[PDB]
Symmetry: D2
């Protein structure tokens, strides 16, 4: 409903930050 939708959005943000840290370093 919105539990899985949110979870998915959280892990997409975690992964975008992982990526942005690989860009900076």
């Amino acid at each position: 409903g919105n539990a899985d939708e949110x979870y998915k959005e959280x892990e997409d943000x975690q992964e975008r930050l992982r990526k942005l840290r690989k860009k900076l370093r």
Copy 2:
């Protein structure tokens, strides 16, 4: 300096999302 400090803050936010996902699930 500037880069190292930004890198560490991005890691901190990534780690909070990692914890939020566990709290959600």
Copy 3:
């Protein structure tokens, strides 16, 4: 329970990013 807890955590992350953007610019 966890609806308000999550909401609060989301707005803290939004505010940390606002802050980090004021640091960069």
Copy 4:
């Protein structure tokens, strides 16, 4: 360049959290 692009990505993530808070509530 480097700064402008990082600034814009931080703004994009901030805007996603802004939207998630509305979806949660």
